[model samples]
Target chain A: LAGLAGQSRIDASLKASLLRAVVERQRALPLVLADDAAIRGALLSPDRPSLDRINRKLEALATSAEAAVIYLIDRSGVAVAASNWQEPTSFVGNDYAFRDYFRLAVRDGMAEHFAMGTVSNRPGLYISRRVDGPGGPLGVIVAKLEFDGVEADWQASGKPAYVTDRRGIVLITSLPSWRFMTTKPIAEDRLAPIRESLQFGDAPLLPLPFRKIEARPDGSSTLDALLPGDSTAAFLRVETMVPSTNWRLEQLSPL
Target chain B: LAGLAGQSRIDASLKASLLRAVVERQRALPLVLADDAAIRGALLSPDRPSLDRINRKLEALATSAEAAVIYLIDRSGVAVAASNWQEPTSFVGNDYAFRDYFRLAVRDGMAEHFAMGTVSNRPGLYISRRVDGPGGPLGVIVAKLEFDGVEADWQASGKPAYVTDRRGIVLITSLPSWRFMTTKPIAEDRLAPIRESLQFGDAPLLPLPFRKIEARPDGSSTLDALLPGDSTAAFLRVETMVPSTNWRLEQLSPL
Candidate 1:
């Protein structure tokens, strides 16, 4: 029964609506620059060791979610400092040249995707950045976050959450029974209409939110709700930029 | 035989001297910010396609080094664009989230390491950076360079090139017959002195210019040399940021 529903064609309008809602909600929030002047000032100020300043900010970011690991590098693409309280000894000043994402960040500036072998030494999303430091051009900043927090949030909202990259690497899914990564490949056919609708040409499209009340396999009914606003409406919104990859946070409420 | 040289320990002072000479020679070249400005401009200008502008700059960088692929991302940790004329599609929009280096970059803002899977679907050294964009928070930049080019350069100069994350994940090697992605477990006993001299904490250390030289079996060698002045040289000098990670580019003078 669940398999049938998984294969079922979702209403185009419904998906779009839900996507819009999620995107809008995320966009409405204040943009969080990983390293703002305040943070940079603290790092460069001679009074305090740059490591301490970096650690304070990393600790702040980690509190927002559950577990967080922050990495810092200088202009030469070298790891300068790191904070992974959970695995402090494992990181710190480790060299990360063998990691593909670090190279990508140094050469391109920013890179995001669903990756494994990070946190539990398993695959997860690796987000990185390049910044201008007081010393000159900083190398890159990397953050490794687990999906459990996001998954729990989706479950609490009674919604099925799924995340995919621009090329469609499924990073996380709330539904455990199904293999989200294998089932949904980001082929051109499925993405063509989406790309056209979003006006995105080849670049990764932002997250789109949608909501709808639909029947479940158990013969019970489900009400899909947006994160906030327009309780009765089923809608989807797109977020142009989110810290993670192209992701959507959906809400399904029982009617 | 080549195997004999691999096991032999070259004079530390001699190696450091040669490495410093090469770095100084490279640094004497003219410095230009045109390429940097071009990349920064493309990322900031709303009208310009972020990926296209990055690709253009990457092309210039690769041409100088004969690299296979180059990528760029913004402060948000999204891969804006990538180009490897030889394998353009290998990484145009592919995310680097699963990569350890990417995580390190997001945490610290700059990182370098070796990893598997190039835009060409081969093994290579991946370097990353965090730069300031017109929009305040520019993300990370990544460069995918073939190990062969570095190896060729090394052979010409009699230097061995290797890359590792601060955690000691070896990404590439240019030994006489060693394979890439092969790990050389540096025991604590062996790593202790080097770590102390390199000033590496628990994390890995990158060797600086004209510091010290250490040679070992498994085709691994370490030395300190002056940081390169040009982007390429800067890119090659992995030790400038984190002294403890003890990462180095061992250039063997051409026999």
Candidate 2:
């Protein structure tokens, strides 16, 4: 019953997150720089076969890989083409100028962000890569990590596990009720940016009903919480990290 | 998958502890309130064949559950029937009146304690449930919760996990080096009785290396700890409880 995949729970979770990121990043390679000249022209024209071709390719890629939406954002952060263009909240034509993922990609050729999508309202990690043409920079190619299936895999584990952002915001979780929740209290300053950019919605960022009473080296912690019937219990916590995205992986068992 | 046997990790551990308690209590059923017929007869004859019959039945239950050992003690605190009857460190014929777990069980209906066995020296949780005979308290039924296998299961999950007594003494663990350790510093008075009873060896009960910097309301916690390379890190601790045993379960994710 152990090591079927040759790794432990926390290890498995970390590997899954990393693998997903890798697959999505690898998915960006050909799309970032293509030999086809018309692909770059499509970004500017916002018209005909070029538009249709990129959208079709993006749609196929989105379907094949685990992505909520596959789209292209211009230097100014406008969605030029998107796999989700048919949907009511299609990313096409949306402005992403203020988003860190867009800003970072323009400056650094790549960026990653885990937050609630502005149009989709669903939370996911956005991985973006820069596309180059005759011009200095054509635009940015972006993919959203679709975690519904990954979460289902975790749910099957029957182990309460989750991933939290640097600020302790739970962006991914096997337990649905915990999604978009914060592990710590939020300050007004943090909230303003998170809200203004619509990275996370107006949804009350609730804290879990738990407290840490003790912690151990080897990266473990002892937590206390009230259970059904007013009974309380402590937990032994274990963790891993999604380094590139600044996210953390977690699993819990009893003492 | 989602619960190989329909049991989640925390639920599985909690149920396992409870089942072990129940089976031992079940074994005590006829012995405690036997209308003073066969039970008292079995106790009267020293080294009698009747006691052998009772021991045989108890052994089957212990083996089925993979429990370390099963034993019974009379009001006078002499071990009568034991699963480890043939072993040199058998509980049979041993004086357990000094053991609080045994004393408390006789006084109350049942009791539990995590400590080293006076004879075996192996640390485990003792689940004791009292039985009242036709006259009064017949004796106590006890079972040592064997977690060596359970720890292996947790190990397969790839998370470092452990259980501690109310005093924070490590009783069960996935990490062997952590066994017989403590999460908090011990006072001399407490250590003396623990050593005198041989419930825990003369092992130094060192505090687990960690500090709880902040605890959040949402069943999440901020923990600060030094890691390899002197790189200190923080974690989000999540926890649940094995309610019947007052034990806590926890997992941490890096933040």
Candidate 3:
């Protein structure tokens, strides 16, 4: 029935909570950086030297912080300074107005969105916080966090695990192909709008290869899943909420 | 009946689990560094250039990793290479054989212990892993993780929180004065040996100000105690186990 009959259902909850904790821990650094006076000043006055200094500081902080990329975007959505200023694909002149994370952060003070990178082509969570000035929002500070190490751990579990947003879109998953997938079918109207937004790049936005067989009162569900390697199996699906976010972690074990 | 009527008893459990996740995440890096061939070769052969290269690598990793200090100790327990090699208060040349973490890592492959730094006078957890050579154990690599950021978060809650080892000794706490304090009285015989080992320095191992008022079957307790600022209060003590370690986190809310 189940491949990984090793640990109890409690183990899935623990792993899910730990993944949530990892995301929660990454939040503090971005908030601190957003409030930094230097970053705030860089946005108000973007002198070449000041931007250069800020660029180097971002690079230093990126080394200390878990972020793969850290950059500051101005009111016009142009990145004035970035940690990868020296790289060929540097974000110094990149415009991020199209990013949902940028739009949400500017309006709500902070926001996080998981999506495929426009430039890097990699998938990661972009955490953004708005820097406030006396008049209004100065700019947005963003820290992109990658989950390769975390995903690798999930892959090693021999069970399927993933995190889904409020819309039921898979944000993080053990199977790379499963990422950006939907747990339920999306309406044609919603899919068109989502595709226009370009939050998930060119992803097909297809539903996952799993169907619910039985729903238990305890929240665990029995499922018939077409798993990786083109295999079919019966799995018990367990879920836990990720603290501080509208995300839920689901783990599937052979029942 | 509690001051932190702010959140349910569930909040304490959540915070404790996040802290545990932070510690658990740190374990992966040390294990990876220990198995590096360069680190293993340096322990087998002590050349100045090789040691210098390893020193800079340790420094680079220390920035990316959440360690306050990362150093390598030879079999003699003398630090040959350290991330702080260039600092005035460097760990290089320091003998750490007296430290329990070193002894345990050499025998058990890896170990972690929380204590006050003899030189820095700052309290942190020392995580150590043994590098193995073809013949036998090569050396021990250690990373010291400080808790100031974590303690600051705990302090902001306006409630007291602390973590205890197997011996009931306070390791990490919101109140600076409560660190190194014991939850229970220590016997004279054990106290003498503990002092001789110098694991906790010369601080008197007195019991915490709180005394148990009621014990609940659910594992939470009520306590009457003298809190900081020389004030007395009744508190509800909630506890959660830190996964993968013998440590337990206790949070006190005023009742």
Candidate 4:
């Protein structure tokens, strides 16, 4: 069901726009949440008798506002409240000390990370903002944003799109099976810690199941790919910007 | 005083990153207020007693934002309010029927356009969003983002950066002389109104003073450029996607 439209100048730009939307979403979350006084207040004062009420309200608001998961982490990087506590694998008790989202937010007041949810197994980006009290940081408020909603919009346009990190690791993809794949080879040393974290689960991180025929001077490439619900075919690989991750989106349109 | 640094793969990517950051800012503004109820309600209710108050507030926010300009346009394509009303070239009552931004946003519910600002005598991207209410639409909220702040970032990174549109018009360039030029030839017939509208000025739209060295298969090109710092130099044109306007960023690193 997924296929790239034949690559024309406009087709490439269309794919590029679709992919930019995904990465732009990743970059805008922190700016949107930078001044959420209510959320920050709740995270800063758990001793408040009304704290329980606001945490539940936050959960409802996060879900209704289209965030996949929302959590607050104490200075120690342990989740104290979350949107998914009702679910079995809720992130309420998890420790994320090693995660860049937590570490960087602690250091810089805000940070973002794109990876798999350690407990949920789903992949998304985490936007974190530090909540500071009189002494120092009281906690961090994080919003987890998965791409399923944007992917739904992409599906309506009938194009298959994906984004790959600097190391060629596929961070987001329109095609479900292609997520977490690789664009090319990775050195063994770089792959070891990723495997230990199980961030991508047992993802093989193999090269995309496509053969490249050309990569032209206009950000368009040609690839031979096997489409879902269709036989193997050649497609044009239209790429675009994913600035937040220094990633490129490979959108394939059938030739 | 800012100029391109010595070239390397990292420098090329740095240029690419710098250019991408500029375009990415253009992409994020639309997402931030996509679903603002108050802005939408006020736009839909221009006849309300509070209309003047809301316009003043919007103007203040837009002015305080440090953007080039901002305006609200009604469905009939006339700007009803502008942040720069105090300035001589204010777009307060101008009709934007000739601008693709107005036409496309009316037709598609949202739109982005990059061009030489006839009114401001500057170049920037116009980000527009539809504001709707009870019956249907009220107007569009338009944000004009100039690139000087972004150019400063590119300057700090030491690279030559630019963006070209569908017609090969150089809309934004780190090099002053490159603005309003063309990447390719255009017949006078097609270039006349663009000049008459004063959108790009009466200045000639000369081809970029460059000779193509080689266009590689990986969407990168080598060019022999006549630099304005007044020397001929070899540079690698590392192209990247700026999907918001269907434009491409040509980031050059000295080779």
Candidate 5:
């Protein structure tokens, strides 16, 4: 009886259709991220010091977006600069070590997820990367923005959208709550169906937002998203270049 | 040296930018899936008896979608109804006993993945779902499609796409390749990165598609899309209608 029911839910037609959509969208993410990275690199170069110069360019792009925020953190996990600074002093030196982004940066070089804290701090997704300096690792670069901002951007652009990382953390989301970081484990009732339908690969031992630390079937340990929804639409883009930790910059905007 | 080099490959700015992109993309996927599901439900309602009628309506909305296939299976692993049957003999009454789809359907309710076998002696990605009968038992509905045809549809649609199962196999590929079935394993490596980046809750494993599963973190799995230069862009979409099968689907395309 259980077997019979399982079979009914596997929609061969839907799977094929959705697979095609995911692949196409995923294909465009790298190109978008690469382009964004190039622009960021130019803005953060030593020759472009005046924060206003960078902020103006980013603002021009973000103004038409739904929402945007960019963070510049020093080596100590403190926000040193920002593009959307409501109170420059409120965030300028705030320590973020307790935050997952900081731990992700330190342990994995990059990390991202939805989070909530203060009211002004609406629940949203975050992406962070470690920055290196002349002496060694200097600080971290971060980008925080509302989910609506991405929707507005994609709706306006009508093109495939994406966020890229120099290392492996590229994710291109278009859903409103894709970034919601929750502490609760996925309900057993919900998980049971997925478990029965799913083949036994490396099962994630914990809930969402908690990084899976077990070695993959392939023996490498990187973060894994465990939602049983859209696998193809969500992805991580990884690239390698000559290592350098010049001050890194981030850009965020709505549409 | 390798660890340091890996660390250097990413910096603060790059991480921040990538994180924001991923979060935003994830945020947008559910909306896209919800929309797609709505359209699919309307077109393939049990009330619509004529397969041609359903196909015609779907074609109008799908616009340039190369082909659309839909099926309804029973608890016994039989496709009770389907649309677009160019070859009815190949599908109807054919027991999927030897197929992974059959196993998942029987055990869970839904199952999906790229399978290579003679279902009418053709190769393609098989997406199946579990259906509920009068007594709360389970059955299956599935769709089998050629990979290339789907890719053409994706190019025309210009939308980020995905394919998910009630379980958690998202087959996201623009071009169909048996590579996933013949070369990949059912271990952590194949599913982790995709799971982590897409945040698929916790993925349930499907059966291994191949033998002598070579486990390597860097090596590609049946669920992973290793693009040129070793970069990956992928996502997962979850579903729960086929509770018995844990029907989940994954769609992985390159960015």
Candidate 6:
């Protein structure tokens, strides 16, 4: 069982590393963008041609970085330019004042959020950095990164793996059906507030079909879980915390 | 100058990220190696065949991880097995009690040290982790990583860049002559203890030929410095701290 414990820990850590590597690659993009003179100028003004140029630059950067979208917001959380400005689902002209990524980045200089994309109906991790000026924070630059590639790797691993927020809500998962599912049921109060955020859509944030059989001091456990299109079966579950974030990556292997 | 400040910050961060990526890739190797049953058994016993197998395993791991060498030292800091066991500079019989990496890893869970290798006469970062058993720490597993590729990149950029320890001693540098040099002269009292550590050999820990021209509040500065085979020239110096360490990466660009 010591060997099993070690192997599971390694497995969980690998999953976390995979996610972090992808995120880290694009993490610097927003920081760099937030410091760009063109981005700053566009944030401060509504010039048509300049905004067009800034939008195109964002598009190029988004493509190069494999990000779903890159957008610049003004002080009031209204997007002035976006990589997807040419698309029907462009973020341009949208008010993101309610977004946690926007609010926290404005407050803390930078922030990260993973949620369902309301426009594209997709989900991604949003990395945001505040753009500062002489007056104060001018706005924020946001990069939305999807995890299809990472999710594909986890799916190919032939094991059940998922990432959970501090509240235990699954943000990314190999099992598509498990996304947004919690390790335990969400309380009504918590569910209502989360639903109000409009971050996860209207999906029921119910608990995963996991019945814990054994818990170990080292944080590994045995569980009877019902996976998609599969009957309940026993498996070994282990988890590791993602560095610099209040999140955890959990993996379940066959018993 | 805002653009220059941003560019230098990005450059410094890029260098730090490069070093971190290399180190992180090999970081997991020691963690997994420490948990290997065979390695644990070899640590507990001095059986020849077991030691040979473990030594071979370390060699394979080192080669695969692109590390200079991997070695296992017993609780008392005597090397029991090493990847370079077959070499004339074998570490198997060496005592690493005087090494800070060993002392700190044994005290803490893990530690990192950058120094000139005593046996190989090369410079690398030593990453060490303590191996534990029911009886407490059994020994430590260490992997040494050289920075030739990173240094080469710095050299190719045609700009001087170096990493300095907390004491401001240059540990890694694009200019080979600058290694073991300091941003400022080392005080005699501190120099004596460092010399006794035998970490940097007998090289005179003199200051680099740098004269500060201007200091800025944002941490970027102008300096006049003598370069290898070149005359003194003014440069813009910017630095960033490497994550999880007291080390700082400083880069110089032509003024």
Best by DockQ: 3
Q: Model 2, B53: alpha-carbon shift in Å?
A: 83
Off by over 4 Å in 2: A1-38, A44-46, A183-186, A203-207, A225-233, B1-255
**Alpha carbon lDDT at B157, candidate 6:** 60
lDDT of 2 by residue, A134-205 (tens): 677777878776567557646655445787777777777777777767777988777777655437657566
TM-score of 6: 0.51
Q: B176 in model 5: Cα distance from truth in Å?
A: 9.3
TM-scores of chain A, one for each prediction: 0.51, 0.79, 0.89, 0.82, 0.40, 0.93
> Across residues A1-255, which tens digit of lDDT does each residue of candidate 4 receive?
122222243333434443454445443444443334444556666554545654575576465445787777877988777777677867777897887788888899887677777657888888787766657777777877787855654454445678787778787777888887887788777776666443664777788898757776655677788868988888766776653357776676656
Each model's lDDT comes to 0.43, 0.61, 0.76, 0.64, 0.37, 0.78
TM-score of 5: 0.28
What is candidate 6's lDDT per residue for B76-140, written digit by digit as tens?
99999999998887899899998888998999978888777886778888888888777688999
Model 1 stretches astray by more than 4 angstroms: A1-48, A64-67, A85-90, A133-136, A156-161, A176-180, A184-255, B1-255
What lDDT score goes with residue B148 in model 5? 50
Candidate order by lDDT, decreasing, is 6, 3, 4, 2, 1, 5
**Candidate 2 vs candidate 4: which has greater lDDT?**
4
Q: What digit string (tens of lDDT, one per residue) describes model 6 on residues A86-193?
A: 999889999998799999999999988887788677988899999887778899999998888678767655567998887778888898888888876678787877
What's the CA RMSD for each of the models? Answer: 26.1, 26.1, 15.7, 13.9, 24.7, 24.6
Task: Give the higher-DockQ candidate: 1 or 6.
Answer: 6
- Candidate 3 Cα errors over 4 Å, as ranges: A1-113, A116-255, B1-8, B196-198
Q: What root-mean-square deviation over C-alphas does model 5 reach?
A: 24.7
Which residue pairs show backbone clashes in model 4?
A4-A252, A4-A253, A4-A254, A5-A253, A215-B217, A217-B219
Query: TM-scores for chain B, in order?
Result: 0.50, 0.72, 0.91, 0.78, 0.37, 0.90
lDDT of 4: 0.64
For candidate 1, give the lDDT of residue B92: 48
Give the per-residue Cα lDDT of candidate 2 at B241: 53
**Which window of 10 residues has the lowest lDDT sum in candidate 4 chain A?**
A1-10
